[PDB]
Write a protein that holds these residues in place. Structure first.
Motif, PDB file in Angstrom:
ATOM      1  N   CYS A 204       0.859  -1.190   0.000  1.00 18.98           N
ATOM      2  CA  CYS A 204       0.000   0.000   0.000  1.00 18.98           C
ATOM      3  C   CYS A 204       0.897   1.243   0.000  1.00 18.98           C
ATOM      4  CB  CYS A 204      -0.978   0.006   1.170  1.00 18.98           C
ATOM      5  SG  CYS A 204      -1.955  -1.509   1.328  1.00 18.98           S
ATOM      6  N   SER A 234       1.120  -1.485  -6.345  1.00 17.34           N
ATOM      7  CA  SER A 234      -0.166  -1.573  -5.674  1.00 17.34           C
ATOM      8  C   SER A 234      -1.102  -2.290  -6.660  1.00 17.34           C
ATOM      9  CB  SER A 234      -0.721  -0.204  -5.335  1.00 17.34           C
ATOM     10  OG  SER A 234      -1.915  -0.403  -4.606  1.00 17.34           O
ATOM     11  N   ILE A 236      -4.348  -2.669  -5.841  1.00 16.57           N
ATOM     12  CA  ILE A 236      -5.638  -2.076  -5.559  1.00 16.57           C
ATOM     13  C   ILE A 236      -5.680  -0.545  -5.482  1.00 16.57           C
ATOM     14  CG2 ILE A 236      -6.596  -4.239  -4.534  1.00 16.57           C
ATOM     15  CD1 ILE A 236      -5.803  -2.067  -1.905  1.00 16.57           C
ATOM     16  N   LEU A 238      -5.848   2.782  -3.630  1.00 16.78           N
ATOM     17  CA  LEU A 238      -5.343   3.173  -2.312  1.00 16.78           C
ATOM     18  C   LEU A 238      -6.124   4.265  -1.550  1.00 16.78           C
ATOM     19  CD1 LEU A 238      -1.506   2.818  -2.959  1.00 16.78           C
ATOM     20  CD2 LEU A 238      -3.013   1.186  -1.857  1.00 16.78           C
ATOM     21  N   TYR A 240      -9.023   3.871   0.040  1.00 15.01           N
ATOM     22  CA  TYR A 240      -9.757   3.252   1.136  1.00 15.01           C
ATOM     23  C   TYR A 240      -9.006   2.925   2.410  1.00 15.01           C
ATOM     24  CZ  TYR A 240     -12.974   3.435  -2.756  1.00 15.01           C
ATOM     25  OH  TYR A 240     -13.714   3.891  -3.831  1.00 15.01           O
ATOM     26  N   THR A 242      -7.671   0.610   5.757  1.00  9.77           N
ATOM     27  CA  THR A 242      -6.980  -0.680   5.909  1.00  9.77           C
ATOM     28  C   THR A 242      -7.882  -1.916   5.776  1.00  9.77           C
ATOM     29  OG1 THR A 242      -5.248   0.478   7.144  1.00  9.77           O
ATOM     30  CG2 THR A 242      -5.269  -1.954   7.330  1.00  9.77           C
ATOM     31  N   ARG A 245      -9.211  -2.214   1.995  1.00  8.78           N
ATOM     32  CA  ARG A 245      -8.087  -2.637   1.158  1.00  8.78           C
ATOM     33  C   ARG A 245      -7.852  -4.121   1.322  1.00  8.78           C
ATOM     34  NH1 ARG A 245      -5.438   1.664   3.652  1.00  8.78           N
ATOM     35  NH2 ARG A 245      -3.744   0.316   4.409  1.00  8.78           N
ATOM     36  N   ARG A 248     -10.375  -6.603  -0.170  1.00  7.82           N
ATOM     37  CA  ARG A 248     -10.196  -6.719  -1.608  1.00  7.82           C
ATOM     38  C   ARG A 248      -9.030  -7.657  -1.923  1.00  7.82           C
ATOM     39  NH1 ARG A 248     -13.650  -5.075  -4.929  1.00  7.82           N
ATOM     40  NH2 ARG A 248     -13.253  -3.849  -6.826  1.00  7.82           N
ATOM     41  N   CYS A 262      -0.720  -0.731   6.568  1.00  7.19           N
ATOM     42  CA  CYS A 262      -1.655  -1.731   7.072  1.00  7.19           C
ATOM     43  C   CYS A 262      -1.341  -2.095   8.525  1.00  7.19           C
ATOM     44  CB  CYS A 262      -1.676  -2.963   6.164  1.00  7.19           C
ATOM     45  SG  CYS A 262      -2.468  -2.697   4.557  1.00  7.19           S
TER      46      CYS A 262
END
Ligand code: SAM
Ligand code: ZN
Ligand code: ZN
Ligand code: ZN
Length: 428
Positions: A204, A234, A236, A238, A240, A242, A245, A248, A262
């Protein structure tokens, strides 16, 4: 290949490692696409072979649904277009394989054509891909079967299907290693498989960014990388918190991130910013609104496939009205609904509505995301193009300059997308 190495990353399987230093904006490596597909909705806008966004696109006479720069591109794309050309016409309106089935059919065609290691597999091979077959439940295993049935239904003609449902292995491999090719505004151009790029693990706090130059993937440092340091992208979005994320990453990639962001949960309090109102909300007032927030994201996700733009805009405003009571407008859940609404206005050709939403988004967006973020670079691009379009050229040039500032690092200074924006600043 040089200045980089494959290695066993503890508790992350195989990964990519630096053997030399890399500076912000440096190209670590490029990867030609092993297999790729132009998304149905972009047919005619881009060349099926090289992904060139041009106006003089020559249509395939044989099917009338594949467009190319010329005849050289047409010839080169035939070993792959052959799979769809006739079926598209024969099935007509009944031709509807998912992009996964489309891409997987091409992976099977490349294995028949080129069984040897391709220049896309210098460190990792498609055969060697991680599948996560063992973690697939009965729902997920069934979705792969719906897709195996479609592969048989539509690609039966030119392909020799492998072994048992060792196709279940191939579909799981694409699900876990597949790539989405997006444009300068983060709009979906297609799907591709990039073996060497698929070797990088997730963080992340990525130190690299994957951008595309046609069908070629390029990897550039967005943080300084020193020898022995692992190279991370990454997987996903970023924006959102912890938990979001990690839900997902668990669902799609079967892992939990334990990176700085995280472990620490640093950006979580600001991401879910609560209004500093006379009499605080209460612990359960937040948790109830977060449960409502997640639900509405997914309700809108569903709804957009079957609702009218006005119905879709009503969901945005009424969601933001209920959440406004507890949540600050900088709150990621507020930003999501504002972004969705901007998207709706853009569709309706309501440029003022889209611009008045984009302005509310950009400042919190920059804050919640890392320094070099394609999410923020494209938001500057949409704003600059909305300004420039509505004839507010001063603000347009400033927003477009902001976009270029991020893109010089992520895309490289010499990138066609950057020459295109500069020409937008020159003429208008
Ligand atoms: C696209 S591959 C990356 C290369 C991979 N580890 C391999 O050797 O095949 C994706 C898979 O690698 C693992 N992975 C990636 N990033 C990770 C991380 N930060 N922590 C744990 N596992 C990770 C997960 O198994 C993920 O589904
Ligand atoms: Zn072309
Ligand atoms: Zn055709
Ligand atoms: Zn993380």
């Amino acid at each position: 290949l040089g200045g980089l190495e494959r290695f066993c990353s503890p508790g992350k399987g195989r990964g990519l490692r630096a053997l030399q230093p890399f500076q912000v904006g440096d190209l670590l490596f490029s990867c030609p696409a092993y297999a790729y597909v132009l998304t149905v909705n972009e047919r005619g806008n881009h060349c099926e072979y090289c992904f060139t966004r041009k106006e003089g696109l020559s249509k395939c006479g044989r099917c009338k649904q594949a467009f190319y720069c010329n005849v050289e591109c047409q010839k080169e794309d035939w070993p792959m277009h052959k799979l769809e050309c006739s079926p598209m016409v024969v099935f007509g309106e009944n031709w509807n394989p998912s992009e996964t089935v489309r891409l997987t059919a091409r992976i099977l065609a490349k294995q028949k054509i080129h069984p040897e290691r391709t220049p896309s597999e210098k460190l990792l091979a498609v055969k060697e891909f991680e599948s996560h077959l063992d973690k697939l439940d009965n729902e997920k295993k069934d979705l792969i079967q719906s897709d195996i049935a479609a592969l048989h239904h539509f690609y039966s003609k030119h392909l020799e299907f492998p072994d048992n449902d060792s196709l279940v292995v191939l579909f799981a491999q694409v699900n876990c290693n597949g790539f989405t090719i997006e444009d300068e505004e983060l709009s979906h151009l297609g799907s591709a498989i990039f073996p060497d790029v698929a070797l990088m693990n997730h963080s992340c706090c990525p130190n690299v960014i994957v951008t595309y130059k046609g069908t070629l993937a390029e990897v550039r440092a967005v943080q300084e990388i020193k020898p022995g340091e692992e190279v991370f992208t990454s997987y996903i979005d970023l924006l959102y918190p912890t938990e979001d994320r990690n839900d997902r990453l668990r669902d799609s990639y079967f892992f939990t991130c334990e990176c700085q962001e995280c472990t620490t949960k640093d950006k979580d309090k600001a991401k879910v910013e609560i209004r500093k109102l006379s009499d605080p909300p209460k612990a359960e007032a937040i948790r109830d609104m977060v449960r409502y927030a997640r639900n509405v994201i997914e309700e809108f996700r569903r709804a957009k496939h079957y609702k009218s733009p006005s119905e879709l805009l009503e969901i945005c405003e009424l969601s933001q009205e209920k959440m406004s009571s507890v949540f600050e407008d900088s709150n990621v859940y507020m930003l999501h609904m504002m972004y969705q609404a901007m998207g709706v206005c853009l569709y309706m050709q309501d440029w003022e509505g889209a611009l008045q939403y984009g302005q509310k988004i950009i400042k919190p967006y920059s804050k919640h995301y890392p320094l070099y973020s394609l999410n923020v670079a494209s938001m500057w691009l949409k704003l600059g193009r909305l300004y420039m379009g509505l004839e507010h050229k001063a603000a347009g040039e400033k927003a477009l300059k902001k976009a270029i500032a991020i893109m010089e690092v992520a895309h490289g200074k010499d990138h066609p997308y950057i020459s295109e924006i500069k020409q937008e600043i020159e003429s208008h």
